[PDB]
Design an enzyme around this catalytic site. Structure first.
Site, short mmCIF file in Angstrom:
data_model
loop_
_atom_site.label_atom_id
_atom_site.label_comp_id
_atom_site.label_asym_id
_atom_site.label_seq_id
_atom_site.Cartn_x
_atom_site.Cartn_y
_atom_site.Cartn_z
N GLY A 17 83.47 57.31 76.74
CA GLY A 17 83.10 56.05 76.11
C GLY A 17 84.15 54.98 76.33
O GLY A 17 85.34 55.29 76.48
N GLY A 20 86.94 47.79 73.70
CA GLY A 20 86.41 47.91 72.33
C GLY A 20 87.27 47.25 71.27
O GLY A 20 86.75 46.46 70.47
N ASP A 132 72.55 52.27 59.25
CA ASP A 132 72.42 51.75 60.62
C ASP A 132 72.26 52.92 61.61
O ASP A 132 72.96 53.00 62.62
CB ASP A 132 73.64 50.90 60.99
CG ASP A 132 73.47 50.15 62.30
OD1 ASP A 132 72.60 49.26 62.38
OD2 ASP A 132 74.22 50.46 63.25
#
Ligand SMILES: O=C1c2ccccc2-c2n[nH]c3cccc1c23
Length: 259
Positions: A17, A20, A132
């Site tokens: 990943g 950020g 969420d």
């Protein structure tokens, strides 16, 4: 190579990943066992952000013991400049898997659904509403869904997204556990019918109006698993009082009656 978390050295196989500034690396320890290391840069995090990061780390650490559908966190190092978190390593996130898969095996779906309930049930039992939930929030580890985050920390490239999973009461109100039920109901609807309930409304403003409008009939095409139908109808009831809870979902014949 190379990262060092609390003495122990880990060699970087690759970056799973990006961000950020938040980078998840696939790594290997001194005995070549595979882990994930999330790296966060704190050099621009304010005090609320920091506190939210601290808060989620605390809970993830605690809720380790309560379920194995919550991603394992083995150790972590945390200073004023950065965070390093040695974690259980996973095959693929659910959103990427779904996107690539043509259509899910009915057994596989029901099995994933149980995993999702178990994890979301656990966080509820400690006062945590995620609020969420998207397929992206789940990780396939050894053919098994695990919740990666609790939605506490993340308040810090498109044009994305995930308004499809938004429950109506969040929109009308412009808390509570039923919000998470709706969102899970959209993830299942997707695993069932290949799209999310309102996915075909590509206009945003229209989409929300559709989500909150009681006269808008959500479609539920007949399918072999009448259990699955019922589960989907129950999770997507606009009045949260009328909506089914997680305990009720855990006693549902969809996850109990076999199969
Ligand atoms: O986002 C991912 C992720 C995304 C794709 C594939 C594996 C992982 C993964 N494997 N372990 C962890 C721990 C935290 C986050 C993530 C992982």
């Amino acid at each position: 190579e190379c990262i060092s978390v609390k003495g122990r050295i880990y060699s970087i196989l690759k970056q799973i990943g990006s961000g950020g500034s938040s980078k998840v690396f696939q790594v290997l320890n001194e005995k070549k066992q595979i882990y994930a290391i999330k790296y966060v840069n704190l050099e621009e995090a304010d005090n609320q952000t920091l506190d939210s990061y601290r808060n989620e780390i605390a809970y993830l650490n605690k809720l380790q013991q309560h379920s194995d559908k919550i991603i394992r966190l083995y150790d972590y190092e945390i200073t004023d400049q950065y965070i390093y978190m040695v974690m259980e390593c996973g095959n693929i996130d659910l959103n990427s898997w779904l996107k690539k898969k043509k259509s899910i095996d009915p057994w596989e779906r029901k099995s994933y659904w149980k995993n999702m309930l178990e994890a979301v049930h656990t966080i509820h039992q400690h006062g945590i509403v995620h609020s969420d939930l998207k397929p992206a929030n789940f990780l396939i580890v050894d053919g098994m869904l695990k919740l990666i985050d609790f939605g506490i920390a993340n308040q810090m490239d498109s044009q994305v997204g995930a308004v499809n999973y938004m429950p109506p009461e969040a929109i009308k109100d412009m808390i509570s556990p039923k919000s998470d039920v709706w969102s899970l109901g959209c993830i299942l609807y997707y695993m069932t019918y290949g799209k999310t309930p309102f996915q075909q409304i590509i206009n945003q403003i229209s989409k929300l109006h559709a989500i909150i409008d009681p006269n808008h009939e959500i479609e539920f095409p007949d399918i072999p698993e009448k259990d699955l139908q019922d589960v989907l109808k129950c999770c997507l009831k606009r009045d949260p009082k009328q909506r089914i809870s997680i305990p009720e979902l855990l006693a549902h014949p969809y996850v109990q009656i076999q199969t």
